[PDB]
Coordinates of C-alpha atoms and ligand atoms in Angstrom, one line a residue:
Chain A
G1 CA 75.6 84.2 127.7
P2 CA 77.2 85.7 130.9
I3 CA 80.3 87.3 129.0
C4 CA 80.3 91.1 128.5
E5 CA 82.9 90.6 125.6
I6 CA 85.8 88.7 124.2
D7 CA 89.0 90.8 123.8
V8 CA 92.1 89.7 121.9
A9 CA 95.3 91.7 122.7
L10 CA 98.5 91.2 120.8
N11 CA 101.7 91.4 122.9
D12 CA 103.3 93.6 120.2
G13 CA 100.6 96.1 121.0
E14 CA 101.7 99.7 120.6
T15 CA 105.0 98.9 118.9
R16 CA 103.7 96.6 116.1
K17 CA 102.8 98.3 112.8
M18 CA 99.4 98.5 111.2
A19 CA 98.0 98.4 107.7
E20 CA 94.8 99.6 106.0
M21 CA 92.7 97.4 103.7
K22 CA 89.7 98.8 101.8
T23 CA 86.4 97.2 102.8
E24 CA 83.8 96.4 100.2
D25 CA 82.1 99.7 101.1
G26 CA 85.4 101.6 100.6
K27 CA 85.8 102.7 104.2
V28 CA 89.4 102.1 105.5
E29 CA 89.8 99.4 108.1
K30 CA 93.0 99.4 110.2
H31 CA 94.6 96.2 111.4
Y32 CA 97.9 94.8 112.7
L33 CA 100.3 93.8 109.9
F34 CA 102.2 90.5 109.8
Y35 CA 104.7 88.8 107.6
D36 CA 105.5 85.1 106.8
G37 CA 107.2 83.4 109.7
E38 CA 106.3 85.9 112.4
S39 CA 104.9 84.7 115.7
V40 CA 101.4 85.6 116.7
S41 CA 101.1 85.9 120.4
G42 CA 99.0 87.8 122.9
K43 CA 96.2 87.4 125.5
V44 CA 92.6 86.5 125.2
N45 CA 90.5 88.3 127.9
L46 CA 87.0 87.1 128.8
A47 CA 85.0 89.5 130.9
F48 CA 81.8 88.4 132.8
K49 CA 79.1 91.0 133.1
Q50 CA 78.4 89.6 136.6
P51 CA 81.0 87.8 138.8
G52 CA 80.2 84.5 140.5
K53 CA 78.0 83.5 137.6
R54 CA 78.7 79.9 136.5
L55 CA 79.1 79.3 132.8
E56 CA 79.5 75.7 131.7
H57 CA 81.3 75.3 128.4
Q58 CA 82.5 72.4 126.3
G59 CA 85.8 74.2 125.6
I60 CA 87.6 77.4 124.9
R61 CA 89.7 77.8 121.8
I62 CA 91.7 80.3 119.8
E63 CA 92.7 79.7 116.1
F64 CA 94.9 81.3 113.6
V65 CA 93.3 81.1 110.2
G66 CA 94.2 81.8 106.6
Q67 CA 91.1 81.7 104.6
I68 CA 90.3 81.8 100.9
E69 CA 86.7 82.8 100.3
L70 CA 85.6 82.6 96.7
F71 CA 82.4 83.8 95.2
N72 CA 80.8 85.9 97.9
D73 CA 78.1 83.3 98.6
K74 CA 79.3 80.2 100.5
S75 CA 80.8 77.7 100.8
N76 CA 83.8 77.1 98.6
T77 CA 85.6 78.5 101.6
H78 CA 88.7 76.6 102.6
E79 CA 91.4 77.3 105.2
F80 CA 94.8 76.9 103.7
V81 CA 96.2 77.7 107.1
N82 CA 94.9 76.5 110.5
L83 CA 96.5 76.5 113.9
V84 CA 94.7 75.6 117.1
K85 CA 95.4 76.5 120.7
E86 CA 93.2 75.2 123.5
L87 CA 92.8 77.7 126.2
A88 CA 90.6 75.6 128.4
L89 CA 89.2 72.1 128.7
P90 CA 85.5 71.4 129.2
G91 CA 84.5 72.9 132.5
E92 CA 83.4 76.2 133.8
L93 CA 84.1 79.9 134.5
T94 CA 82.8 81.9 137.4
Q95 CA 85.0 85.0 137.0
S96 CA 86.8 87.0 134.3
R97 CA 89.9 85.2 133.1
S98 CA 92.8 86.1 130.8
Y99 CA 94.4 83.4 128.6
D100 CA 97.9 83.5 127.0
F101 CA 98.4 82.3 123.4
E102 CA 101.4 81.9 121.2
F103 CA 101.7 80.6 117.6
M104 CA 105.3 80.3 117.1
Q105 CA 106.3 80.6 113.4
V106 CA 103.3 81.0 111.4
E107 CA 103.1 80.3 107.7
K108 CA 101.5 83.3 105.9
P109 CA 102.2 82.4 102.2
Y110 CA 99.8 84.9 100.8
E111 CA 99.0 88.5 101.0
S112 CA 95.6 89.5 102.2
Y113 CA 93.4 90.4 99.3
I114 CA 89.9 91.9 99.4
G115 CA 88.3 91.5 96.0
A116 CA 85.0 91.7 94.2
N117 CA 84.8 88.0 93.4
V118 CA 87.3 86.7 96.0
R119 CA 88.6 87.3 99.5
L120 CA 91.8 86.0 101.1
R121 CA 91.8 86.6 104.9
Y122 CA 93.8 86.0 108.0
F123 CA 92.3 86.2 111.5
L124 CA 92.4 85.1 115.1
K125 CA 89.2 83.3 116.0
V126 CA 88.2 82.8 119.7
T127 CA 85.6 80.0 120.0
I128 CA 83.7 79.1 123.2
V129 CA 82.2 75.6 122.8
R130 CA 78.7 75.4 124.3
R131 CA 75.5 73.3 124.1
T132 CA 75.7 77.1 119.2
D133 CA 79.3 78.1 120.1
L134 CA 80.3 81.7 120.8
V135 CA 82.7 83.0 118.2
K136 CA 85.0 86.1 118.1
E137 CA 87.2 87.1 115.1
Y138 CA 90.2 89.3 115.2
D139 CA 91.4 90.5 111.8
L140 CA 95.0 90.4 110.7
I141 CA 96.7 91.6 107.6
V142 CA 99.6 89.9 105.8
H143 CA 101.9 91.5 103.2
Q144 CA 104.0 89.6 100.7
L145 CA 107.4 91.3 100.3
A146 CA 109.8 90.7 97.4
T147 CA 113.1 92.0 96.0
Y148 CA 114.2 92.7 92.4
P149 CA 117.2 94.5 90.9
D150 CA 117.0 98.1 89.6
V151 CA 117.5 97.6 85.9
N152 CA 115.8 98.8 82.7
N153 CA 114.2 96.0 80.5
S154 CA 113.0 98.7 78.2
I155 CA 109.9 97.0 76.9
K156 CA 107.8 98.5 74.1
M157 CA 104.3 98.0 72.7
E158 CA 103.1 99.4 69.5
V159 CA 99.8 100.3 68.0
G160 CA 100.2 99.9 64.2
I161 CA 97.9 99.6 61.2
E162 CA 100.7 99.3 58.7
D163 CA 102.4 102.0 56.6
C164 CA 99.8 104.7 57.3
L165 CA 99.8 104.9 61.2
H166 CA 102.3 103.7 63.8
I167 CA 102.5 104.5 67.5
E168 CA 105.1 103.1 69.9
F169 CA 105.1 103.1 73.7
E170 CA 108.3 102.4 75.5
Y171 CA 108.7 101.9 79.2
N172 CA 111.7 101.0 81.4
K173 CA 110.8 97.7 83.2
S174 CA 108.3 94.8 83.1
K175 CA 108.4 94.6 87.0
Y176 CA 107.6 97.5 89.2
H177 CA 107.4 97.9 92.9
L178 CA 104.3 99.4 94.6
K179 CA 105.9 102.8 95.1
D180 CA 107.8 102.8 91.8
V181 CA 107.6 105.2 88.8
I182 CA 106.8 103.8 85.4
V183 CA 109.0 105.7 83.0
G184 CA 107.9 106.0 79.4
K185 CA 108.0 107.7 76.1
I186 CA 105.4 107.7 73.4
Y187 CA 107.0 107.8 69.9
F188 CA 105.0 109.0 66.9
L189 CA 106.9 106.9 64.4
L190 CA 104.2 107.4 61.8
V191 CA 101.0 109.5 61.5
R192 CA 99.6 109.4 57.9
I193 CA 96.3 109.6 59.8
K194 CA 95.3 112.1 62.5
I195 CA 94.7 110.7 66.0
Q196 CA 91.3 111.6 67.6
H197 CA 92.2 110.2 71.1
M198 CA 95.0 108.3 72.8
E199 CA 94.9 106.7 76.2
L200 CA 97.4 104.9 78.4
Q201 CA 95.7 103.0 81.1
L202 CA 96.9 100.8 84.0
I203 CA 94.4 98.1 84.8
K204 CA 93.9 95.2 87.2
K205 CA 92.5 91.8 86.2
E206 CA 91.2 89.6 89.0
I207 CA 90.6 86.1 87.8
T208 CA 88.5 84.1 90.1
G209 CA 87.9 80.7 88.6
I210 CA 88.3 77.0 89.3
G211 CA 89.1 74.8 86.3
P212 CA 86.7 75.4 83.4
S213 CA 84.6 77.7 85.6
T214 CA 86.4 81.1 85.2
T215 CA 85.5 84.7 85.8
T216 CA 87.3 88.0 85.2
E217 CA 86.7 91.3 86.9
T218 CA 88.6 94.2 85.4
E219 CA 89.2 97.6 87.1
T220 CA 91.0 100.7 85.9
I221 CA 93.6 101.9 88.4
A222 CA 94.8 104.8 86.2
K223 CA 94.3 106.8 82.9
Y224 CA 96.8 108.8 81.1
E225 CA 95.0 111.0 78.6
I226 CA 97.8 111.6 76.1
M227 CA 95.7 113.1 73.4
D228 CA 92.3 114.9 73.3
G229 CA 93.6 115.3 69.8
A230 CA 95.0 116.2 67.4
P231 CA 98.6 117.3 67.0
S232 CA 107.4 112.4 71.2
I233 CA 105.8 112.7 74.7
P234 CA 107.4 111.6 78.0
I235 CA 105.3 109.4 80.3
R236 CA 105.7 109.2 84.1
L237 CA 103.2 107.1 86.0
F238 CA 103.5 107.3 89.8
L239 CA 102.3 104.1 91.4
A240 CA 102.5 105.5 94.9
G241 CA 99.4 107.7 94.7
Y242 CA 97.4 104.7 93.8
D243 CA 96.7 101.6 95.8
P244 CA 97.7 98.6 93.8
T245 CA 98.4 95.1 95.3
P246 CA 101.3 92.9 94.3
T247 CA 100.7 90.6 91.4
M248 CA 99.2 87.4 92.8
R249 CA 99.4 84.3 90.6
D250 CA 97.4 81.1 90.8
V251 CA 97.0 81.5 94.5
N252 CA 95.9 78.0 95.6
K253 CA 94.5 77.8 92.0
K254 CA 91.6 79.8 93.5
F255 CA 92.5 83.1 91.9
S256 CA 95.0 85.4 90.3
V257 CA 95.5 89.2 90.2
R258 CA 97.4 90.7 87.4
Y259 CA 98.3 94.2 86.2
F260 CA 98.4 95.4 82.6
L261 CA 99.4 98.4 80.7
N262 CA 96.9 99.2 78.0
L263 CA 97.6 101.5 75.0
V264 CA 94.3 102.7 73.5
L265 CA 94.1 104.9 70.4
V266 CA 91.2 106.3 68.3
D267 CA 91.8 107.5 64.8
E268 CA 89.9 110.1 62.6
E269 CA 87.7 107.2 61.4
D270 CA 86.7 106.4 65.0
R271 CA 88.4 103.1 64.7
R272 CA 89.7 101.8 68.0
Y273 CA 93.2 100.3 68.4
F274 CA 94.2 98.3 71.5
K275 CA 97.4 96.8 72.8
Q276 CA 97.9 95.2 76.2
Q277 CA 100.9 94.1 78.2
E278 CA 101.3 92.5 81.5
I279 CA 103.5 94.1 84.2
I280 CA 104.4 92.5 87.6
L281 CA 104.0 94.5 90.8
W282 CA 105.8 93.7 94.0
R283 CA 106.1 95.1 97.5
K284 CA 109.5 96.3 98.5
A285 CA 110.5 95.7 102.1
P286 CA 110.0 98.8 104.4
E287 CA 113.5 98.6 106.1
Chain B
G1 CA 117.3 75.6 110.1
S2 CA 119.2 78.3 112.0
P3 CA 122.3 79.6 110.2
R4 CA 125.6 77.9 110.7
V5 CA 129.1 78.0 109.1
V6 CA 130.8 75.3 107.3
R7 CA 134.5 75.1 106.2
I8 CA 135.2 72.8 103.3
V9 CA 138.9 72.2 102.5
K10 CA 139.3 71.2 98.9
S11 CA 140.2 67.6 98.7
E12 CA 141.5 66.0 95.6
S13 CA 139.2 67.1 92.8
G14 CA 136.2 68.7 94.5
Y15 CA 134.4 70.4 97.4
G16 CA 132.3 67.3 96.9
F17 CA 128.9 69.0 96.8
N18 CA 126.4 70.1 94.3
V19 CA 124.0 73.1 94.1
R20 CA 120.6 73.4 92.5
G21 CA 118.2 76.3 92.3
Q22 CA 116.5 79.3 90.5
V23 CA 117.7 80.7 87.3
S24 CA 116.2 84.1 87.9
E25 CA 117.6 87.0 90.1
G26 CA 115.5 88.1 93.1
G27 CA 112.1 86.8 94.2
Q28 CA 109.7 86.5 97.0
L29 CA 110.7 87.0 100.7
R30 CA 109.8 83.9 102.6
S31 CA 110.5 82.8 106.2
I32 CA 113.1 80.3 107.3
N33 CA 113.1 80.0 111.1
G34 CA 110.8 83.0 111.3
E35 CA 113.4 85.1 109.5
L36 CA 112.8 86.5 106.0
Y37 CA 115.0 85.6 103.1
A38 CA 115.0 86.1 99.3
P39 CA 115.3 82.8 97.4
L40 CA 118.3 80.7 98.2
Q41 CA 120.4 78.0 96.3
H42 CA 120.5 74.7 98.0
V43 CA 122.8 71.7 98.4
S44 CA 121.4 69.0 96.1
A45 CA 124.1 66.5 96.6
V46 CA 126.8 65.6 99.0
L47 CA 129.5 63.1 98.0
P48 CA 129.8 60.5 100.8
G49 CA 133.2 60.9 102.5
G50 CA 133.9 63.9 100.3
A51 CA 135.3 67.2 101.6
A52 CA 131.8 68.7 102.2
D53 CA 130.6 65.6 104.0
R54 CA 133.4 65.8 106.5
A55 CA 132.8 69.6 106.9
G56 CA 129.2 68.8 107.9
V57 CA 127.3 70.0 104.8
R58 CA 124.0 68.2 104.6
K59 CA 121.7 67.6 101.7
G60 CA 119.1 70.3 101.4
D61 CA 121.2 73.0 103.0
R62 CA 120.3 76.4 101.7
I63 CA 123.3 78.7 101.1
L64 CA 123.0 82.1 102.6
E65 CA 126.6 83.1 102.0
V66 CA 129.7 82.0 100.2
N67 CA 132.9 83.2 101.9
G68 CA 130.8 85.7 103.8
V69 CA 129.2 87.2 100.7
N70 CA 125.4 87.1 101.0
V71 CA 123.8 85.4 98.0
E72 CA 120.0 85.8 98.7
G73 CA 118.2 86.1 95.4
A74 CA 121.2 85.1 93.3
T75 CA 120.9 83.1 90.1
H76 CA 122.3 79.6 89.8
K77 CA 125.2 80.6 87.7
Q78 CA 126.3 83.4 90.1
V79 CA 126.5 81.1 93.0
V80 CA 128.1 78.2 91.1
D81 CA 130.7 80.6 89.6
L82 CA 131.4 82.0 93.1
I83 CA 132.0 78.5 94.5
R84 CA 134.3 77.8 91.6
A85 CA 136.7 80.6 92.7
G86 CA 139.2 77.7 92.9
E87 CA 140.3 78.6 96.4
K88 CA 141.5 75.7 98.5
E89 CA 139.2 76.5 101.5
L90 CA 135.5 77.4 100.9
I91 CA 133.4 78.7 103.8
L92 CA 129.6 78.4 103.4
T93 CA 126.9 79.9 105.7
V94 CA 124.0 77.6 105.4
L95 CA 120.4 77.2 106.6
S96 CA 119.7 73.6 107.2
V97 CA 116.4 71.9 106.3
Ligands
LIG1 HG1 82.4 95.2 129.5
LIG2 HG1 96.6 106.4 54.9

C-alpha cells in the first residue's frame, strides 16, 4: 500500500510505567504496563510515503484485545476481551492523518503470561480494511495485583521413612509475594541413616489443558543444595532475584500456573524421597 | 459505582440491611470505576421502608468503609462485627452497582 507505517502513541507516553516480559527466545521485550480498569488512550498516526496518493479503504479500525492462545499452533485462540473503535468509515485517504482513540475503563482480568504451552496477551490492533486488510499490533502488558496480611502460617512438610529416618522442613507462610523471602528451617529429627543428598527446589507447573485433554510443563525456578552429604539448617529463599509470576488458577479454564516447594532427599541406599507442597504467589502493589 | 456516603439512623430493631461476602482476608485488586480495590463486602438485602432504605442504601452496594474505617479485604465477620458496634447512627461509604 501507500502507507510508510502505522504508529500507535499512548497519551501517557513518557510518564507511564513499563514492564519487561521474556520472549520465547529469552530476549527481554519492554512494553507499557496497565492494570484492570485503567483507560487506554492515545493517537494512531498513519503516514503516507507520498502525499496526494489516493488510498481507497473499506474502513479503519483500532481494537483492544485480551487474547488466550493455547497450544502454539492455531486456532484454539479466543478473545476474552474485545473493544472496537472505528477511526474512519469506508472512504479514502490522500494525506497523513492522526486519529484519536480512547477506551474508557478496560477490563483486564488476567495478568499477561508468556508460556511454553500457552500465551495470554493484550494488544492494541490497528486494522485497515481493504479489498487482505493491513494490520498493526501494539503490545501491552497487564499485571494482576493483590494484597495479603503479613502473618506466619508456619507450614511444614516432612520426608519420613518411619523410625529410622525423619526430616522436617518448616517455612513461615503458604502465600508469598513476588519480592518476598521464604523463611525456613530444616530439622533433622531423626537420622538412623546417612543422607547422600538433600535438595530444596522451587518449581512452577503450567497446566495447559481443556477438559480431559491436559498437559503439564514443569520448570525449576530454584535449587537449594542443602547437602552434598553427609553430616538444624536455616533456609532463606529470596524470591526477588528470580522472575516468578503470580499464581494463576483456572484462567478461563484454559490454563493454570502454580508454584510448589519440593523437598528432595537421597539416602545412603540411593533411594529417593519426595515431598511437594503448593505455595501461592501474588504481586504486591508498587505504591 | 462512584463512592458515596450513607447515614443510617438506627430505627427500632435494625439498620435494616444485610451483608454478604468473602470469608477470607485480602484478595485480588480489581477495578470498580477504574479504581482498584481489594475485595469488598456488599449489601445483600435492604428491608423496604427500613432505616437503610430511607438512608438510600441500595441492594448490591459494596462497602468501602464503616464509620470512616476502610474495610477493603476484610472478612465477613470483621465487617458484620463492626456494623454491630450498636451505635445509633451508622455511616457507610459505599460503591454502588
Ligand atoms: Hg516513514
Ligand atoms: Hg535403620
